[PDB]
Design a protein around this ligand. Structure first.
Ligand SMILES: O=[N+]([O-])c1ccc(O[C@H]2O[C@H](CO)[C@@H](O)[C@H](O)[C@H]2O)cc1
Ligand SMILES: O=[N+]([O-])c1ccc(O[C@H]2O[C@H](CO)[C@@H](O)[C@H](O)[C@H]2O)cc1
Ligand SMILES: [Ca+2]
Lengths: 706, 703
């Protein structure tokens, strides 16, 4: 029961390459398509830029009347002739390093100030950055759809055209995220006031939750400036809930408009979050799509992977992101809408030898399809390049359609996929560990992020000490998930929201990284999990508040935990590992009632315990560790071993990463060497040992029959 | 010509390894020192931790009475017996991931409130962090010196002992940097007031500079919070100057105390600033030692180089840092007091094959000595590690003196260095390009840094648009310097403060990355440079203000420049290069009378001019570009070619970096491959070689 794309009721690996017709000499379009097809790619992908085709207000060219490379119709016809399916992405935003992110110059000059995203002061955040639900913006977006959408509709697969998929806009919220500011446009404010009225019904109900003293809803303003009171936190938390409804309204409006043209193809969206070759903030961005993914089973989200290099420094980002996408979208294949090929920036090199390993590591890490971005380099015509004339470097093909070094790497990877896809797409890893994804810890893009200008969340001011962003980046993303991957223990991630208990009972262990706050439903779910026979590992805190920081002690009471928070040395001992460095002086100190103490402070106070509760097991650690020392890996390994979980292989070099994927028929062993060392090692199945030599930053794949 | 260490009257490449006796099994001390010597290393370096030897107040153990690893006397004997010189570093601060950063637990327990660094509300910043000039802190510091300095004096090189250098404290100011927090201890603020009174003499003089409305110096409060007004910018600027004098005062008290024991060896200090494997902030940290470097020509500053990996992503960091240290310390060798060996962080790998390439690149980039940090791993004794049990990973030796992969890399690099040091140390690059270092742009560690979470400096609130940190990081460090190195053009850096005109006239071009403000002295210096025959390249602004943001247009008026600041598309054309991405909407649009327009906005407005002024040449670009496109390399290459500057070689692969080092007799060509690609290329003077990924090749030529 893997999820994978299907062609004529067979497992099909979606292999696309991105080829920007608008940035290639049209005399060479066919050569680019033939060379893509010759790699074993089945699909080609492109933006259709609004700025490129609405050359002036109400002057459209899709036929190359005014510039040969405006002949979208001819590009579509060539894709059909060269037996490639086509993904089209008509925006309105395309990003794509295109002037004004794809929006017409004439549009941005004409729009009045209230079409734009505005800061708390009423000023324009950026001259390219519109307010998504601006009446003016959506009027012009609709007139752009009125011209491009009939073309897309006529050329759909169901009309024997090549068009199989369409992206709606591009990375909703990404422009906002990188700007470092949130949108306070008066459309946003007014929609937020309606959301608050709908949510609370009476000002008394809102006052009771927030601990505010408003006389009426007319006194409540959209939250701005720093969080100083728990009532400011509550307002911001609802502001985050609102923005998820807001992005759902945007994509809904676009989708309803598109469907009205007879467009029945698969609709997509693309997830931003990588920056400087890490993706620790991506889970924050995917979390902004929570309401889209609940309301639209028919929009498939795909990842925009930009690793830039392939090493232990970022080995864990693609797997964690693939796992988190699966957690939020479990009924669709994990795929990369944008799968790095070459480099968007001259000064940031993309080596074929890095990317080839990333491609193989992505297959190890469960990817089921991808679109090489950029397969073909572009040259911007007519000064449309945001940052210079050349679009991408170190691609598979240069703009002229010459093969570059990466072409042979992609041909190699694609050849393996086409030979193995029928088995490989149907393989799973044996995950005996589940890691809880608690989305509200990620709902901070308005107040706390790697990219927000203003740090608005200081939890110490609220009488708290566990910052949710610190927890989800350093304890979970760069900590637990990194540690498990480094130790070669398979894990799955499961979204705790509306989570079915039956979807947790298959695991030997459930791991919850918890702050001091957690909603009643999740506290009850984890309670029922243990009582019914589940094995829970919970740290660094038993929560005692709900998402509004009001009292909620359900899980503490159901587990018979008593604790006091006390200051000590950062270093604790745990399971007989000395000098385990922990993130906080404050730790939870548990009494040893009906429990085994397994962790101790420098004053020998109990900061961790194990107990049996109903049919289940609980391990609580009152301290925070990620992976910033060897003791942290020793501690994770010890915790996993509490339930006799074993690695799939014995490998003589602990720095070698492996993944075993198998079904009934076949076993694939992926070895990954994320280190600048030629490694010679031996291995065997945990049930004579084979010797292997692996180059720096390289891979081996072994296939076994049975 | 060149500055280098000397041994037996000959050029000597200082090869030191860091070995923390206090973190090593004393039964294996001799074994560590023998394995270090066997790599060809000549020196061993260590902290002498105050907490480790003053075990209780006025109870000193330097002879292993209470713990065998407290036997400093025996470690010194072993260095002598195994023929290694010794660098000692007795603090008071040692940092070194040692609990309390090396200060005794008993001291920190007992010190009054007024001995600690205080926030602007009078609260202790950190139970770890004393005020450097606390009378109570210096009293106890001095009682520690009274016991450890006689031991160092005994064994110092001027008494023919093994101790050749001593470090004073450790990374002075590093805590103000990483925290963003200034010390507001009333003792520090009293010193700040004295500094201001001494500087301005009367409140009237200060009011005329700051545009303040004080009736006396009694109305004057230390700056704090966000800069909202130009008067706040002025106060914070002098607060930065004050902290450079404050650090000078601290190091001077330590130095005078040390000299009183008759310790006459070379004193040192160490420069922090690398994080996450780049060093774009280190020039800010070096700027904090400006007053020390001016007043103490007998204190050698060395660099703390922490590259973490070796690729095109960080290739430019170590050269830029080495060049800026040479600019501020021209009479002493450029050396790394802490030269990455292994990793402080288990999860941040240090590959022997990366570090080997970094060591050879350091030689190409002009390093004259270094101290492998950490040569030997350590095990923290009885809880005294701030982090876990282990100190460093992937070192040359583990804590039990096991050889690890890096050992063989250090032995190979050391053998090369010993074979070549007599000629290599006496080689320089031929730099025809000089890049100006304007230190006031770097004086922002209290208000604007990569480490400072929230920014106190927002120049738009002051009617400016060129932020000095954005300029010195993106336009200068990751822009011009990265670009010249990528293009294989030699540059030197020169400190513009008190700068000799004579020392600019050797160069065919001087490059100035200018904000809207620049002091009268530097404006006068650059005026005289061009008028006397110099070729100046200046962008992205003709300055119009001084360091206090008061009108100063000396350079503008001397050069006959007129401009209006106007908004346009980020892209300009320059020297016929289309689509040059520039940082700002706002650009300087120049009157072109007596001038050649060479750059244009999307609307064809003149945003760059060339001009003859007296006997020299001026190139002004009213726009900011770094290195974020191939057009940026094209533009730097075009600008360098205006004065017919040539690379020292033609190399067939543009992605191969090279450094040609020569003297009259000897040439070394260092080829560096910072890319994950096997490269085959050929070279000739302005012959076909293969280099592995992240690797190197050195070629010698007799002249
Ligand atoms: O300039 N801009 O407004 C702008 C620039 C870049 C941008 O996104 C791009 O860079 C992000 C950071 O690396 C990626 O996470 C994202 O996937 C990618 O598409 C969006 C807007
Ligand atoms: O926690 N602390 O108080 C603390 C931590 C680290 C520290 O300095 C160390 O790390 C810096 C940042 O990477 C380096 O630039 C510097 O060279 C090195 O010595 C100083 C104090
Ligand atoms: Ca003039």
């Amino acid at each position: 029961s893997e999820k994978y794309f299907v062609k004529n009721g067979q497992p099909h690996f979606l292999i696309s390459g991105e080829v920007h017709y608008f940035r290639i000499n049209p005399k060479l379009w066919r050569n680019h398509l033939q060379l893509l097809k010759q790699t074993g790619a089945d699909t080609v992908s492109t933006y259709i830029p609004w700025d490129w085709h609405e050359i002036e207000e109400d002057d459209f060219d899709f036929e190359g009347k005014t510039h040969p490379a405006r002949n979208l119709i001819r590009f579509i016809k060539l894709c059909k002739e060269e037996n490639l399916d086509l993904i089209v992405k008509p925006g309105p935003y395309i990003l794509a390093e295109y002037e004004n992110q794809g929006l017409p110059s004439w549009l941005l000059k004409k729009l009045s100030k209230n079409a734009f995203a505005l800061d708390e002061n009423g000023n324009v955040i950026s001259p390219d950055l519109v307010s998504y639900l601006s009446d003016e913006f959506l009027e012009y977006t609709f007139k752009w759809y009125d011209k491009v959408m009939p073309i897309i509709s006529k050329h759909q697969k169901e009309h024997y055209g090549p068009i199989t998929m369409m992206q709606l806009c591009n990375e909703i919220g990404v422009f906002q995220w990188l700007s470092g500011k949130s949108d306070y446009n008066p459309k946003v404010i007014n929609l937020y006031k309606e959301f608050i009225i709908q949510r609370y019904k009476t000002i008394e109900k809102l006052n009771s939750v927030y601990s505010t003293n408003y006389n009426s809803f007319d006194d409540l303003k959209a939250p701005s400036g720093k969080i100083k009171l728990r009532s400011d936190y509550c307002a911001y938390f609802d502001f985050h809930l609102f923005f998820r409804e807001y992005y759902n309204k945007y994509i809904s409006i676009l989708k309803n408009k598109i469907r009205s043209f007879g467009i029945n193809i698969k609709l997509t969206h693309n997830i931003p979050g990588w920056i400087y070759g890490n993706a620790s903030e991506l889970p924050m961005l995917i979390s902004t799509y929570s309401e889209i993914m609940k309301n639209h089973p028919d929009i498939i989200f795909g990842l925009d992977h930009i690793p830039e290099f392939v090493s232990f420094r970022n080995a864990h980002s693609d797997l964690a992101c693939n796992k988190i996408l699966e957690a939020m979208q479990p009924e669709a294949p994990v795929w990369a809408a944008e799968f790095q090929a070459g480099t968007r920036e001259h000064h940031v090199k993309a080596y074929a030898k890095d990317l080839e390993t990333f491609y193989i590591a992505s297959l190890a890490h469960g990817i089921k399809g991808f679109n090489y971005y950029m397969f073909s380099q572009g040259i911007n015509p007519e000064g449309k390049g945001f940052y210079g004339k050349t679009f991408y470097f170190q691609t598979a093909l240069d703009a002229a359609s010459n093969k570059l070094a990466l072409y042979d790497s992609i041909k190699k990877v694609n050849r393996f996929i086409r030979k193995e896809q029928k088995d490989l797409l149907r393989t799973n890893v044996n995950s005996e560990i589940c890691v809880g994804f608690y989305k509200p810890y990620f709902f901070t893009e308005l107040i706390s992020s790697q990219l927000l200008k203003e740090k608005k969340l200081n939890v110490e001011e609220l009488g708290l000490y566990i910052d949710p962003r610190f927890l989800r980046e350093e304890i979970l993303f760069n900590g637990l998930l990194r540690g498990l991957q480094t130790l070669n223990y398979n894990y799955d991630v499961v979204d705790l929201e509306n989570c079915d208990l039956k979807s947790l009972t298959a695991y030997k262990q459930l791991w919850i990284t918890s702050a001091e706050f957690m909603d009643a439903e999740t506290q009850n779910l984890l309670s029922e999990f243990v009582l019914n026979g589940g094995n829970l590992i919970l740290y660094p805190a038993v929560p005692t508040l709900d998402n509004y920081l009001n009292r909620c002690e359900i899980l503490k009471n159901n587990f018979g935990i008593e604790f006091i928070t006390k200051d000590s040395s950062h270093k604790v001992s745990a399971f007989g590992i000395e000098d385990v460095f922990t993130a906080f002086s404050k730790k939870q100190i548990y009494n040893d009632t009906n429990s085994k103490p397994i962790a101790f402070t420098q004053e020998n106070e109990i900061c961790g315990i194990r107990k049996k509760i109903g049919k289940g097991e609980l391990t609580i650690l009152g301290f925070a560790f990620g992976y910033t020392s060897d003791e942290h890996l020793e501690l994770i390994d010890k915790l996993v071993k509490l339930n006799k979980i074993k690695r799939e292989l014995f490998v003589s070099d602990k720095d070698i990463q492996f993944v075993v994927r198998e079904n009934n028929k076949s076993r694939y062993i992926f070895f990954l060497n994320y280190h600048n060392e030629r490694k010679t090692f031996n291995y065997r199945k945990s049930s004579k040992s084979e010797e292997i030599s692996i180059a720096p930053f390289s891979y081996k794949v072994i296939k076994e029959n049975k």
